[model samples]
Target: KVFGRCELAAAMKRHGLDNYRGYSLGNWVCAAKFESNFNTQATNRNTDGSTDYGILQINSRWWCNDGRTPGSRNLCNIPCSALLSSDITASVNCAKKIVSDGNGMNAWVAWRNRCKGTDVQAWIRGCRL
Candidate 1:
Protein backbone atom coordinates (compact mmCIF):
# COMPACT_ATOMS: atom_id res chain seq x y z
CA LYS A 1 0.00 0.00 0.00
CA VAL A 2 1.13 3.53 -0.68
CA PHE A 3 0.81 5.62 2.46
CA GLY A 4 -0.23 9.22 2.83
CA ARG A 5 2.39 11.56 4.25
CA CYS A 6 0.95 11.91 7.71
CA GLU A 7 -0.02 8.27 7.68
CA LEU A 8 3.55 7.30 7.14
CA ALA A 9 4.60 9.66 9.88
CA ALA A 10 2.23 8.07 12.35
CA ALA A 11 3.40 4.62 11.43
CA MET A 12 7.04 5.42 11.76
CA LYS A 13 6.52 7.28 14.99
CA ARG A 14 4.64 4.37 16.51
CA HIS A 15 7.44 2.10 15.46
CA GLY A 16 9.95 4.16 17.44
CA LEU A 17 11.56 6.14 14.65
CA ASP A 18 11.07 9.52 16.31
CA ASN A 19 14.43 10.83 17.40
CA TYR A 20 16.01 7.47 16.77
CA ARG A 21 19.75 7.90 17.03
CA GLY A 22 19.35 11.66 17.07
CA TYR A 23 17.52 11.57 13.73
CA SER A 24 14.07 12.98 14.13
CA LEU A 25 10.77 11.73 12.78
CA GLY A 26 10.99 14.29 10.00
CA ASN A 27 14.24 12.77 8.81
CA TRP A 28 12.64 9.36 8.43
CA VAL A 29 9.53 10.92 6.94
CA CYS A 30 11.51 12.75 4.32
CA ALA A 31 13.76 9.82 3.55
CA ALA A 32 10.83 7.49 3.08
CA LYS A 33 9.05 9.99 0.84
CA PHE A 34 11.94 9.90 -1.59
CA GLU A 35 12.87 6.30 -0.91
CA SER A 36 9.76 4.83 -2.45
CA ASN A 37 7.13 7.55 -2.41
CA PHE A 38 5.58 5.59 0.45
CA ASN A 39 5.34 2.49 -1.69
CA THR A 40 5.39 -0.86 0.07
CA GLN A 41 6.29 -2.90 -2.98
CA ALA A 42 8.70 -0.56 -4.66
CA THR A 43 12.01 -1.95 -5.84
CA ASN A 44 15.08 -0.84 -7.75
CA ARG A 45 17.96 -2.90 -9.05
CA ASN A 46 21.42 -1.64 -8.36
CA THR A 47 24.23 -1.69 -10.92
CA ASP A 48 25.93 -4.20 -8.67
CA GLY A 49 22.97 -6.48 -9.55
CA SER A 50 21.51 -6.34 -6.05
CA THR A 51 17.93 -5.22 -5.65
CA ASP A 52 16.67 -2.73 -3.09
CA TYR A 53 13.37 -3.62 -1.48
CA GLY A 54 10.45 -1.92 0.29
CA ILE A 55 9.68 1.65 1.38
CA LEU A 56 13.14 2.16 2.82
CA GLN A 57 14.64 0.24 -0.10
CA ILE A 58 16.63 -2.09 2.12
CA ASN A 59 19.52 -3.51 0.14
CA SER A 60 20.21 -7.13 -0.62
CA ARG A 61 23.95 -6.67 -0.71
CA TRP A 62 24.41 -5.75 2.92
CA TRP A 63 21.09 -6.05 4.66
CA CYS A 64 18.86 -8.79 3.33
CA ASN A 65 19.54 -11.94 1.37
CA ASP A 66 17.81 -12.38 -1.97
CA GLY A 67 19.84 -15.48 -2.75
CA ARG A 68 21.29 -13.41 -5.57
CA THR A 69 23.53 -10.58 -4.46
CA PRO A 70 27.21 -11.33 -4.69
CA GLY A 71 29.10 -11.37 -1.39
CA SER A 72 26.05 -10.30 0.55
CA ARG A 73 26.44 -10.07 4.32
CA ASN A 74 22.74 -10.55 4.99
CA LEU A 75 23.28 -8.58 8.15
CA CYS A 76 19.59 -8.25 8.75
CA ASN A 77 19.26 -12.03 8.24
CA ILE A 78 15.96 -11.76 6.43
CA PRO A 79 14.82 -12.56 2.95
CA CYS A 80 14.65 -9.46 0.85
CA SER A 81 11.11 -10.43 -0.10
CA ALA A 82 9.97 -9.90 3.48
CA LEU A 83 10.47 -6.17 3.06
CA LEU A 84 7.78 -5.85 0.39
CA SER A 85 4.77 -6.24 2.61
CA SER A 86 2.10 -3.62 3.25
CA ASP A 87 2.92 -3.98 6.94
CA ILE A 88 6.36 -2.44 7.16
CA THR A 89 7.52 -4.11 10.36
CA ALA A 90 10.29 -6.06 8.73
CA SER A 91 11.45 -3.06 6.80
CA VAL A 92 11.32 -0.87 9.88
CA ASN A 93 13.28 -3.28 12.01
CA CYS A 94 15.82 -3.76 9.30
CA ALA A 95 16.14 -0.03 8.86
CA LYS A 96 16.92 0.44 12.52
CA LYS A 97 19.52 -2.25 12.30
CA ILE A 98 21.07 -0.56 9.31
CA VAL A 99 21.35 2.67 11.20
CA SER A 100 22.92 0.89 14.18
CA ASP A 101 26.22 1.10 12.37
CA GLY A 102 26.58 4.72 13.51
CA ASN A 103 26.53 5.91 9.94
CA GLY A 104 23.51 7.99 11.00
CA MET A 105 21.04 6.70 8.46
CA ASN A 106 23.63 6.96 5.74
CA ALA A 107 22.56 3.53 4.59
CA TRP A 108 20.37 5.26 2.04
CA VAL A 109 21.64 7.56 -0.64
CA ALA A 110 18.11 8.90 -1.02
CA TRP A 111 18.25 10.22 2.54
CA ARG A 112 21.56 11.96 1.95
CA ASN A 113 20.49 13.65 -1.25
CA ARG A 114 16.84 14.29 -0.50
CA CYS A 115 16.33 14.28 3.28
CA LYS A 116 19.54 15.67 4.70
CA GLY A 117 20.34 19.21 5.81
CA THR A 118 16.94 20.49 4.77
CA ASP A 119 14.09 21.95 6.78
CA VAL A 120 13.07 18.41 7.61
CA GLN A 121 10.35 19.48 10.03
CA ALA A 122 8.14 20.17 7.03
CA TRP A 123 8.16 16.55 6.12
CA ILE A 124 5.89 15.80 9.02
CA ARG A 125 4.61 19.31 9.50
CA GLY A 126 1.16 18.48 10.79
CA CYS A 127 1.55 14.84 11.65
CA ARG A 128 1.00 13.41 15.08
CA LEU A 129 0.29 10.16 16.81
Candidate 2:
Protein backbone atom coordinates (compact mmCIF):
# COMPACT_ATOMS: atom_id res chain seq x y z
CA LYS A 1 0.00 0.00 0.00
CA VAL A 2 1.16 3.48 -0.85
CA PHE A 3 -0.02 5.42 2.14
CA GLY A 4 -1.01 9.03 1.91
CA ARG A 5 1.44 11.28 3.72
CA CYS A 6 -0.96 12.26 6.47
CA GLU A 7 -2.19 8.70 6.85
CA LEU A 8 1.34 7.44 7.26
CA ALA A 9 2.11 10.15 9.79
CA ALA A 10 -0.95 9.24 11.83
CA ALA A 11 -0.05 5.58 11.74
CA MET A 12 3.52 6.21 12.81
CA LYS A 13 2.26 8.32 15.70
CA ARG A 14 -0.10 5.57 16.81
CA HIS A 15 2.87 3.20 16.80
CA GLY A 16 4.74 5.52 19.16
CA LEU A 17 7.39 6.61 16.65
CA ASP A 18 6.42 10.29 16.73
CA ASN A 19 8.85 11.18 19.48
CA TYR A 20 10.72 7.95 19.90
CA ARG A 21 14.41 8.45 20.67
CA GLY A 22 14.06 12.21 20.30
CA TYR A 23 13.14 11.76 16.64
CA SER A 24 9.98 13.50 15.60
CA LEU A 25 7.12 12.24 13.44
CA GLY A 26 8.35 14.57 10.74
CA ASN A 27 11.77 12.98 10.69
CA TRP A 28 10.36 9.51 10.41
CA VAL A 29 7.97 10.65 7.74
CA CYS A 30 10.75 12.26 5.82
CA ALA A 31 12.94 9.22 6.10
CA ALA A 32 10.15 7.03 4.84
CA LYS A 33 9.63 9.27 1.88
CA PHE A 34 13.18 8.80 0.72
CA GLU A 35 13.74 5.20 1.77
CA SER A 36 10.49 3.63 0.71
CA ASN A 37 8.19 6.28 -0.68
CA PHE A 38 5.47 5.16 1.74
CA ASN A 39 5.20 1.80 0.03
CA THR A 40 4.22 -0.91 2.49
CA GLN A 41 6.03 -3.72 0.66
CA ALA A 42 9.17 -1.83 -0.21
CA THR A 43 12.43 -3.77 -0.40
CA ASN A 44 16.06 -3.07 -1.24
CA ARG A 45 19.20 -5.15 -1.58
CA ASN A 46 22.61 -4.26 -0.29
CA THR A 47 25.94 -5.22 -1.86
CA ASP A 48 26.77 -7.33 1.17
CA GLY A 49 24.07 -9.83 0.19
CA SER A 50 21.76 -8.43 2.86
CA THR A 51 18.38 -6.95 2.01
CA ASP A 52 15.99 -4.38 3.42
CA TYR A 53 12.32 -4.96 3.99
CA GLY A 54 8.98 -3.25 4.62
CA ILE A 55 7.85 0.36 4.69
CA LEU A 56 10.88 1.44 6.67
CA GLN A 57 13.29 -0.98 4.96
CA ILE A 58 14.72 -2.52 8.10
CA ASN A 59 18.00 -4.25 7.31
CA SER A 60 18.25 -8.02 7.20
CA ARG A 61 21.85 -8.29 8.41
CA TRP A 62 21.19 -6.81 11.83
CA TRP A 63 17.55 -6.21 12.51
CA CYS A 64 15.63 -9.06 10.95
CA ASN A 65 16.45 -12.76 10.59
CA ASP A 66 16.65 -13.62 6.92
CA GLY A 67 18.39 -16.93 7.65
CA ARG A 68 20.80 -16.06 4.81
CA THR A 69 22.24 -12.70 5.70
CA PRO A 70 25.44 -14.41 6.90
CA GLY A 71 25.84 -13.97 10.65
CA SER A 72 22.63 -12.03 10.98
CA ARG A 73 22.08 -10.86 14.54
CA ASN A 74 18.33 -10.58 14.33
CA LEU A 75 18.41 -7.87 16.95
CA CYS A 76 14.76 -7.21 16.39
CA ASN A 77 14.03 -10.96 16.63
CA ILE A 78 11.79 -10.87 13.61
CA PRO A 79 12.01 -12.64 10.27
CA CYS A 80 12.87 -10.20 7.53
CA SER A 81 10.06 -11.50 5.37
CA ALA A 82 7.55 -10.77 8.07
CA LEU A 83 8.50 -7.12 8.05
CA LEU A 84 7.36 -6.83 4.45
CA SER A 85 3.74 -7.55 5.21
CA SER A 86 0.96 -5.02 4.86
CA ASP A 87 0.52 -4.89 8.62
CA ILE A 88 3.28 -2.50 9.67
CA THR A 89 3.53 -3.35 13.35
CA ALA A 90 6.61 -5.51 12.99
CA SER A 91 8.42 -3.03 10.77
CA VAL A 92 7.66 -0.06 13.01
CA ASN A 93 8.61 -2.08 16.04
CA CYS A 94 11.92 -3.01 14.47
CA ALA A 95 12.51 0.58 13.36
CA LYS A 96 12.02 1.73 16.93
CA LYS A 97 14.52 -0.86 18.04
CA ILE A 98 17.03 0.42 15.52
CA VAL A 99 16.86 3.92 16.96
CA SER A 100 17.12 2.43 20.42
CA ASP A 101 20.65 1.38 19.56
CA GLY A 102 23.82 3.42 19.71
CA ASN A 103 23.68 4.14 15.98
CA GLY A 104 20.34 5.90 16.62
CA MET A 105 18.28 7.43 13.80
CA ASN A 106 21.34 8.07 11.70
CA ALA A 107 21.68 4.32 11.44
CA TRP A 108 19.61 4.83 8.33
CA VAL A 109 21.45 6.55 5.54
CA ALA A 110 18.22 8.08 4.31
CA TRP A 111 17.57 9.74 7.64
CA ARG A 112 21.08 11.09 7.76
CA ASN A 113 21.18 12.41 4.22
CA ARG A 114 17.57 13.40 3.70
CA CYS A 115 15.98 14.05 7.04
CA LYS A 116 18.51 15.12 9.62
CA GLY A 117 18.57 18.52 11.30
CA THR A 118 15.66 19.85 9.31
CA ASP A 119 12.25 21.13 10.25
CA VAL A 120 9.44 19.09 8.68
CA GLN A 121 6.66 21.22 10.10
CA ALA A 122 5.73 22.63 6.72
CA TRP A 123 5.69 19.22 5.09
CA ILE A 124 3.28 17.82 7.66
CA ARG A 125 1.01 20.76 8.21
CA GLY A 126 -2.25 19.02 7.40
CA CYS A 127 -1.40 16.26 9.84
CA ARG A 128 -0.99 16.64 13.59
CA LEU A 129 0.15 14.18 16.11
Candidate 3:
Protein backbone atom coordinates (compact mmCIF):
# COMPACT_ATOMS: atom_id res chain seq x y z
CA LYS A 1 0.00 0.00 0.00
CA VAL A 2 2.96 2.28 0.04
CA PHE A 3 2.73 5.12 -2.47
CA GLY A 4 4.21 8.48 -3.32
CA ARG A 5 7.83 8.82 -4.30
CA CYS A 6 8.38 11.61 -1.83
CA GLU A 7 7.01 9.56 1.00
CA LEU A 8 9.52 6.85 0.21
CA ALA A 9 12.27 9.39 -0.11
CA ALA A 10 11.45 10.91 3.27
CA ALA A 11 11.59 7.56 4.98
CA MET A 12 14.89 6.76 3.30
CA LYS A 13 16.34 10.12 4.23
CA ARG A 14 15.22 9.68 7.82
CA HIS A 15 17.22 6.49 7.80
CA GLY A 16 20.26 8.34 6.44
CA LEU A 17 20.14 6.71 3.01
CA ASP A 18 20.93 9.85 1.05
CA ASN A 19 24.52 8.79 0.48
CA TYR A 20 24.66 5.35 2.01
CA ARG A 21 27.52 3.07 0.98
CA GLY A 22 28.46 5.52 -1.79
CA TYR A 23 25.06 5.18 -3.46
CA SER A 24 23.11 8.32 -4.19
CA LEU A 25 19.61 8.65 -2.76
CA GLY A 26 18.30 8.78 -6.31
CA ASN A 27 19.72 5.33 -6.99
CA TRP A 28 17.91 3.75 -4.06
CA VAL A 29 14.69 5.61 -4.81
CA CYS A 30 14.80 4.60 -8.44
CA ALA A 31 15.44 0.97 -7.61
CA ALA A 32 12.57 0.93 -5.15
CA LYS A 33 10.28 2.33 -7.81
CA PHE A 34 11.22 -0.27 -10.35
CA GLU A 35 11.47 -3.17 -7.94
CA SER A 36 8.26 -2.67 -5.96
CA ASN A 37 7.02 0.86 -6.40
CA PHE A 38 7.70 1.32 -2.68
CA ASN A 39 5.22 -1.37 -1.77
CA THR A 40 6.77 -3.35 1.04
CA GLN A 41 4.44 -6.30 0.53
CA ALA A 42 5.56 -6.90 -3.02
CA THR A 43 6.99 -10.27 -4.04
CA ASN A 44 8.24 -11.69 -7.30
CA ARG A 45 8.90 -15.32 -8.14
CA ASN A 46 11.95 -15.48 -10.30
CA THR A 47 12.64 -17.76 -13.24
CA ASP A 48 15.30 -19.55 -11.20
CA GLY A 49 12.60 -20.54 -8.68
CA SER A 50 13.66 -18.10 -5.98
CA THR A 51 11.46 -15.38 -4.58
CA ASP A 52 12.25 -11.72 -4.20
CA TYR A 53 10.76 -9.96 -1.20
CA GLY A 54 9.90 -6.40 -0.23
CA ILE A 55 10.57 -3.07 -1.89
CA LEU A 56 14.20 -3.81 -2.52
CA GLN A 57 13.20 -7.30 -3.54
CA ILE A 58 15.92 -9.07 -1.58
CA ASN A 59 16.23 -12.51 -3.08
CA SER A 60 15.40 -15.76 -1.35
CA ARG A 61 18.42 -17.28 -3.05
CA TRP A 62 20.78 -15.32 -0.84
CA TRP A 63 19.20 -12.86 1.54
CA CYS A 64 16.17 -14.08 3.47
CA ASN A 65 14.49 -17.35 4.27
CA ASP A 66 10.95 -17.69 2.97
CA GLY A 67 10.43 -21.14 4.53
CA ARG A 68 8.89 -22.57 1.38
CA THR A 69 12.33 -22.45 -0.20
CA PRO A 70 15.43 -24.24 1.02
CA GLY A 71 19.18 -23.70 0.54
CA SER A 72 19.07 -19.96 0.92
CA ARG A 73 22.16 -18.24 2.17
CA ASN A 74 19.87 -16.26 4.49
CA LEU A 75 22.60 -13.77 5.06
CA CYS A 76 20.20 -11.20 6.46
CA ASN A 77 18.91 -13.73 9.01
CA ILE A 78 15.46 -12.23 8.62
CA PRO A 79 12.08 -13.66 7.85
CA CYS A 80 10.98 -12.55 4.39
CA SER A 81 7.79 -11.37 6.05
CA ALA A 82 9.80 -8.83 8.00
CA LEU A 83 10.38 -6.96 4.78
CA LEU A 84 6.66 -6.62 4.14
CA SER A 85 5.90 -4.04 6.77
CA SER A 86 4.91 -0.39 6.75
CA ASP A 87 7.97 0.29 8.86
CA ILE A 88 10.85 -0.10 6.42
CA THR A 89 13.68 -0.07 8.93
CA ALA A 90 14.49 -3.72 8.42
CA SER A 91 14.21 -3.54 4.64
CA VAL A 92 16.41 -0.47 4.42
CA ASN A 93 18.97 -1.93 6.78
CA CYS A 94 19.06 -5.12 4.81
CA ALA A 95 19.37 -3.21 1.56
CA LYS A 96 22.31 -1.30 3.00
CA LYS A 97 24.02 -4.51 3.91
CA ILE A 98 23.37 -5.88 0.45
CA VAL A 99 24.86 -2.78 -1.13
CA SER A 100 27.95 -3.08 1.03
CA ASP A 101 28.64 -6.50 -0.40
CA GLY A 102 30.68 -4.77 -3.18
CA ASN A 103 27.83 -4.91 -5.69
CA GLY A 104 26.51 -1.55 -4.62
CA MET A 105 22.95 -0.97 -5.87
CA ASN A 106 23.75 -3.23 -8.77
CA ALA A 107 22.73 -6.08 -6.51
CA TRP A 108 19.20 -5.14 -7.52
CA VAL A 109 18.52 -5.98 -11.13
CA ALA A 110 16.09 -3.11 -11.25
CA TRP A 111 18.89 -0.64 -10.70
CA ARG A 112 20.97 -2.17 -13.45
CA ASN A 113 18.05 -2.18 -15.84
CA ARG A 114 16.37 1.15 -15.22
CA CYS A 115 18.50 3.33 -12.98
CA LYS A 116 22.02 2.62 -14.10
CA GLY A 117 23.71 5.23 -16.29
CA THR A 118 20.57 7.30 -16.30
CA ASP A 119 19.64 10.73 -15.00
CA VAL A 120 18.06 9.64 -11.73
CA GLN A 121 17.60 13.02 -10.11
CA ALA A 122 14.01 13.07 -11.29
CA TRP A 123 13.25 10.32 -8.83
CA ILE A 124 13.67 12.66 -5.89
CA ARG A 125 12.58 15.83 -7.58
CA GLY A 126 10.64 18.36 -5.49
CA CYS A 127 11.33 16.41 -2.30
CA ARG A 128 12.95 18.05 0.69
CA LEU A 129 15.69 16.02 2.28
Candidate 4:
Protein backbone atom coordinates (compact mmCIF):
# COMPACT_ATOMS: atom_id res chain seq x y z
CA LYS A 1 0.00 0.00 0.00
CA VAL A 2 2.64 2.50 -0.99
CA PHE A 3 0.01 4.82 -2.45
CA GLY A 4 -3.39 5.22 -3.91
CA ARG A 5 -3.60 6.95 -7.33
CA CYS A 6 -3.86 10.51 -6.06
CA GLU A 7 -1.25 9.98 -3.38
CA LEU A 8 1.16 8.58 -5.95
CA ALA A 9 0.74 11.62 -8.17
CA ALA A 10 1.53 13.90 -5.23
CA ALA A 11 4.54 11.83 -4.33
CA MET A 12 5.80 11.83 -7.88
CA LYS A 13 5.36 15.55 -8.09
CA ARG A 14 7.24 16.06 -4.84
CA HIS A 15 10.01 13.82 -6.13
CA GLY A 16 10.36 15.94 -9.27
CA LEU A 17 8.96 13.24 -11.44
CA ASP A 18 5.91 15.20 -12.56
CA ASN A 19 7.55 15.70 -15.93
CA TYR A 20 10.87 13.98 -15.69
CA ARG A 21 13.16 13.66 -18.66
CA GLY A 22 10.40 14.55 -21.11
CA TYR A 23 8.03 12.03 -19.63
CA SER A 24 4.80 13.43 -18.31
CA LEU A 25 3.48 12.78 -14.82
CA GLY A 26 0.57 11.11 -16.56
CA ASN A 27 2.99 8.66 -18.09
CA TRP A 28 4.34 7.59 -14.72
CA VAL A 29 0.90 7.53 -13.17
CA CYS A 30 -0.66 5.44 -15.89
CA ALA A 31 2.20 3.00 -15.93
CA ALA A 32 1.99 2.52 -12.18
CA LYS A 33 -1.72 1.90 -12.41
CA PHE A 34 -1.33 -0.84 -14.97
CA GLU A 35 1.87 -2.28 -13.61
CA SER A 36 0.99 -2.91 -9.98
CA ASN A 37 -1.91 -0.66 -9.10
CA PHE A 38 0.49 1.34 -6.91
CA ASN A 39 1.23 -1.46 -4.53
CA THR A 40 4.83 -1.39 -3.38
CA GLN A 41 4.78 -5.02 -2.35
CA ALA A 42 3.53 -6.18 -5.71
CA THR A 43 5.44 -8.97 -7.42
CA ASN A 44 4.88 -10.83 -10.65
CA ARG A 45 6.78 -13.65 -12.29
CA ASN A 46 7.18 -13.16 -15.96
CA THR A 47 6.99 -15.95 -18.48
CA ASP A 48 10.71 -15.58 -19.09
CA GLY A 49 11.27 -16.66 -15.51
CA SER A 50 12.23 -13.19 -14.34
CA THR A 51 10.39 -11.54 -11.51
CA ASP A 52 8.97 -8.04 -11.51
CA TYR A 53 9.51 -5.90 -8.41
CA GLY A 54 7.63 -3.06 -6.77
CA ILE A 55 5.12 -0.57 -8.11
CA LEU A 56 7.16 -0.19 -11.27
CA GLN A 57 7.44 -3.93 -11.67
CA ILE A 58 11.13 -3.81 -12.53
CA ASN A 59 12.39 -6.99 -14.04
CA SER A 60 15.02 -9.12 -12.35
CA ARG A 61 16.48 -9.87 -15.75
CA TRP A 62 18.06 -6.44 -15.86
CA TRP A 63 17.61 -4.67 -12.58
CA CYS A 64 17.68 -6.33 -9.19
CA ASN A 65 19.04 -9.55 -7.77
CA ASP A 66 16.94 -12.22 -6.10
CA GLY A 67 19.79 -14.68 -5.56
CA ARG A 68 18.26 -17.64 -7.41
CA THR A 69 17.66 -15.66 -10.57
CA PRO A 70 20.60 -16.00 -12.92
CA GLY A 71 21.91 -13.51 -15.48
CA SER A 72 20.51 -10.52 -13.67
CA ARG A 73 22.20 -7.34 -14.77
CA ASN A 74 21.64 -6.09 -11.25
CA LEU A 75 22.09 -2.69 -12.72
CA CYS A 76 20.42 -1.04 -9.78
CA ASN A 77 22.73 -3.01 -7.44
CA ILE A 78 19.91 -3.49 -5.00
CA PRO A 79 18.21 -6.68 -3.99
CA CYS A 80 14.81 -7.36 -5.47
CA SER A 81 13.36 -7.49 -2.01
CA ALA A 82 14.44 -3.93 -1.40
CA LEU A 83 12.06 -2.74 -4.08
CA LEU A 84 9.10 -4.41 -2.42
CA SER A 85 8.63 -2.07 0.49
CA SER A 86 6.43 0.86 1.51
CA ASP A 87 9.16 3.46 0.99
CA ILE A 88 9.51 3.80 -2.78
CA THR A 89 12.47 6.16 -2.86
CA ALA A 90 14.85 3.40 -3.85
CA SER A 91 12.44 1.98 -6.40
CA VAL A 92 11.77 5.41 -7.86
CA ASN A 93 15.50 6.10 -8.05
CA CYS A 94 16.10 2.80 -9.76
CA ALA A 95 13.24 3.42 -12.17
CA LYS A 96 14.75 6.78 -13.04
CA LYS A 97 18.08 5.11 -13.62
CA ILE A 98 16.47 2.52 -15.82
CA VAL A 99 14.75 5.19 -17.89
CA SER A 100 18.08 7.01 -18.17
CA ASP A 101 19.67 3.85 -19.46
CA GLY A 102 17.99 4.64 -22.79
CA ASN A 103 14.81 2.61 -22.63
CA GLY A 104 12.71 5.32 -21.05
CA MET A 105 9.26 3.99 -20.12
CA ASN A 106 9.74 1.41 -22.81
CA ALA A 107 11.63 -0.40 -20.07
CA TRP A 108 8.20 -1.29 -18.79
CA VAL A 109 5.77 -3.55 -20.61
CA ALA A 110 2.82 -1.87 -18.99
CA TRP A 111 3.88 1.48 -20.35
CA ARG A 112 4.18 0.15 -23.85
CA ASN A 113 0.93 -1.75 -23.75
CA ARG A 114 -1.25 0.68 -21.85
CA CYS A 115 0.29 4.12 -21.49
CA LYS A 116 1.92 4.61 -24.86
CA GLY A 117 -0.09 6.77 -27.23
CA THR A 118 -3.01 6.63 -24.87
CA ASP A 119 -4.82 9.57 -23.36
CA VAL A 120 -3.75 8.80 -19.85
CA GLN A 121 -4.72 12.11 -18.32
CA ALA A 122 -7.39 10.39 -16.30
CA TRP A 123 -4.66 8.69 -14.35
CA ILE A 124 -4.02 11.95 -12.54
CA ARG A 125 -7.40 13.55 -12.80
CA GLY A 126 -8.55 15.35 -9.65
CA CYS A 127 -5.19 14.70 -8.06
CA ARG A 128 -4.00 17.95 -6.53
CA LEU A 129 -0.33 17.47 -6.94
Q: What is the lDDT of residue 98 in candidate 4?
A: 91
Best by TM-score: 1
RMSD to the native, candidate 3? 1.1
> Which lDDT tens digits does candidate 4 get at residues 29-75?
89998999889999998787799999999889989999867778899
Scored by lDDT, model 3 comes in at 0.88
Displacement of residue 90 (Cα, Å) in model 4 is: 0.9
Local accuracy of candidate 1 as per-residue lDDT tens digits, 95-115: 998898889888889999988
How well is each residue in 63-120 modelled by candidate 3, as lDDT tens digits?
9888877678889889888988889999988888898898788798889999999988
lDDT (Cα atoms) of all candidates against the true structure: 0.92, 0.85, 0.88, 0.88
Write out the backbone clash pairs for model 3. none
In model 3, where do residues sit more than 4 Å from their true spots? Answer: none
Q: lDDT for model 2, on a 0 to 1 scale? A: 0.85
Off by over 4 Å in 4: none
TM-score of candidate 1 against the unseen true structure: 0.96
Off by over 4 Å in 1: none
Clashing pairs counted in every model: 0, 0, 0, 0
Greater lDDT among 2 and 4 belongs to 4
Task: Give the local distance difference test score of model 1.
Answer: 0.92
Give per-residue lDDT, candidate 3, residue 70. 64
